[PDB]
Ligand binder design. Sequence first.
Ligand code: GWJ
Lengths: 402, 536
Amino acid sequence: TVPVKLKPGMDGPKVKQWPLTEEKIKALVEICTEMEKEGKISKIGPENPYNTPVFAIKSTKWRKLVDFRELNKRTQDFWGIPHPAGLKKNKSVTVLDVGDAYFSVPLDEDFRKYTAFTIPSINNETPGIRYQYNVLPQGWKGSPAIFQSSMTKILEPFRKQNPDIVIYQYMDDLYVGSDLEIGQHRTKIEELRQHLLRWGLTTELHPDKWTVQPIVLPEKDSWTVNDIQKLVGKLNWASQIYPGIKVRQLCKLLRGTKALTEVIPLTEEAELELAENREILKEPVHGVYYDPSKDLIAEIQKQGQGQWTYQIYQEPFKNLKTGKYARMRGAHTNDVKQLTEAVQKITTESIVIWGKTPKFKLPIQKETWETWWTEYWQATWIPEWEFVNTPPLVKLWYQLEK
Amino acid sequence: PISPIETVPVKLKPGMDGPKVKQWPLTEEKIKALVEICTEMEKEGKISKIGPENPYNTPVFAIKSTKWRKLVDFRELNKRTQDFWEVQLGIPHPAGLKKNKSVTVLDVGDAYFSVPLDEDFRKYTAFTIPSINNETPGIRYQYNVLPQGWKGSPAIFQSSMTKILEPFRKQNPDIVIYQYMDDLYVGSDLEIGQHRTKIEELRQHLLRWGLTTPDKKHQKEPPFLWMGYELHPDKWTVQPIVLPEKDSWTVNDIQKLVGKLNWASQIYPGIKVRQLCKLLRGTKALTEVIPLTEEAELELAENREILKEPVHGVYYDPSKDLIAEIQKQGQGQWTYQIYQEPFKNLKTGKYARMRGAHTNDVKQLTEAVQKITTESIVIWGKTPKFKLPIQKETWETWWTEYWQATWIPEWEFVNTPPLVKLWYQLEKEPIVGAETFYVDGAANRETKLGKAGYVTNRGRQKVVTLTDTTNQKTELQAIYLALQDSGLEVNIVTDSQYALGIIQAQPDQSESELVNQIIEQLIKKEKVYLAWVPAH
Ligand SMILES: Cc1cc(S(N)(=O)=O)ccc1NC(=O)COc1ccc(Cl)cc1C(=O)c1cc(Cl)cc(C#N)c1
């Protein structure tokens, strides 16, 4: 075992366990009695005051999902593999779960305490069941790192055999990228799983298709005072990104106090202005480049009717990427599901593109989100998030996307 | 007979050191009692007489069977001990107890003193018995077991217990043992005699580890007294809450009262404390005597009558449905009852009017649902099917269009008035023909002087000069004018970033009178179309 430590002066996580369902507790209890036996985890005493949250996600088979977000932050660094720029340009990338790989390697006995976690009980009819990892834990940043030599090794043979195929490791995940056609691709992935499987491992993005979508402005036979106002508003706000966007000629048409419903005729100068503004918006703002030393920020607005809009940026109005996400079959009566779904999606894109997860600003109240985000979580990692109050215009502007 | 229980590794906080506080001086009497006690505890094996090889010290005290007892103040040692995983802070709510044929309560007794101290750590617990009136060298000891009052005792004890029971719970899957502080509430569905025997088994399992326990000699008999509750074999009920009648009510008095009444509101239907609370206005001291108004004297009466009602509940049966029903008792106030079979309530409660900056009933309904859900998840590990006084149409129409992620788990409509609705809906498009007010307000934030008028396409005009206003009241006041001064159909355009707010959230209750006034107005119109245009 390699000695690991917490970053200077940082103490261990002491996050509280959120209450779980009976359904979920019985599952964690099962999974944990197993792992206990196999020596992967051991019950612990009260002298260990640390703690991390644990939950169960979805076969009928339930998986254990620990949230080491705090311990990850408190965990020393190790200066992972450099992001492969081409991954983004592949025709198809597959994600495989190699968290099972860690259970092999032991965890520096001195660090264990910090991995303590608790399985709660309905009605507090009992204290929780406490454990701490004896081996590398899935979801801990120091796991894939500490297993890096061992990982590369097991990987080479497959890379050389197929050097037109790229493989990138983020936490427990393996993103495999090629240009082969679907069938030749997937069959070749299984050729990779099989390869992985003869040690102890186990289990469909199209990056080149993710298009950068522009803002399209409304087109009308006739324009009313209202139409022009709304338009002049979107443009105004937008002048914050593209400063060449002008609303003088338009804002002129609006002089006077006439019924919103009245039709205004468009002056030729006004028409150019619009035309000129459609031209400016035809491409993303220039001068936006990714800086690896800065955080990634992912903001989302609920467009309603199951549509969602998002922007990944580091500097306000200097967007790295933007998108919309329309609800998936089945989530009709569920905002929470579409959101967690959108988040997982956006977060994977970010991993694919820059090899790091973005920090999220979510338009949902903390209680609602904390009470139900698990029910639909499906990834091994967990981004960082904060709850916010959607400014009505950033929304209005992006619903204007093509 | 203490314990063959493996000790727990206790260490002192980051790099600190054991206590060294000087022994408080005591009388020959008090001293002679402490000597007595410690001599007993010396033999029970609880403490050990030590010597000069201990710089550590904690102050012992003598307090009064009126017989002399002792008290060691570990305040220091505690603030210098490591931190432990916090012992269970959440307490079971009867409604979450599965009805069992028999239940036994076993308080573990000589709890702490019965469990081993980490032998390393004992030194830190050394205290000293003073000599006759502060003249030199008295008796010195240290603890061999969890000391009463030391920081880790509870957590250490809880653990040891949990460990000792792992086997039993393993071999008796259909037996249920709740753990709470030093108590074991043991319940099963065996037969009165089978049960009785299994309890004696447990008891004997524990004794074989150092934990004495009750016999039918001392061991509580139902109903069980437990936090404002009475636990009967087939129902729980609330223990009588008595409002003392007096002719002199201090501020302290009326507060403690208002408090017991507020707690009562959760269980009893109809409690009210409006006129009571009214008595607190302007009070100059807790001891102040404030004469009860008539209104006050009356509600207090009515409460005395509500309170003498037999509210009771049932226990949880895992095989039946969980159902929570909500009622809106006044703006922002909600009542709920959670049951399985009709009228047979498992739990009830209400949520106080959450006076916000600005919300609407559907939002608050939503929040009461959130609270109930978490409460339920905790208590039963499940989430209720809901019965809500709201039409699925209103819900869909609201949620489906609210800027924020929202949600209600599975629920069904129930028409139990009043119903929660949307007090108004702003128009989706400008209203043809309907007047078009162009509103505005500007106020010297510094002078708090302003005006807020409008000019419609139709000629009608106005402006008012206002005293005491930050542009935000003008703006809103602007809009307010435009609302009163128009027909049941209007189009109002503004530059107010705050009005844009209303647009996206159409609130039906706020902190500010203004917003209220406007809201009132919005509800009166048949159609309103609010529009925002950039300022300048
Ligand atoms: C009250 C009662 C009496 C009897 S009998 N027939 O033995 O008198 C049988 C079951 C029950 N109870 C039930 O059916 C449901 O309740 C329970 C179901 C299981 C268990 Cl282990 C305890 C209780 C309790 O009554 C209880 C719970 C706590 Cl947290 C504290 C105290 C406390 N203090 C008592």
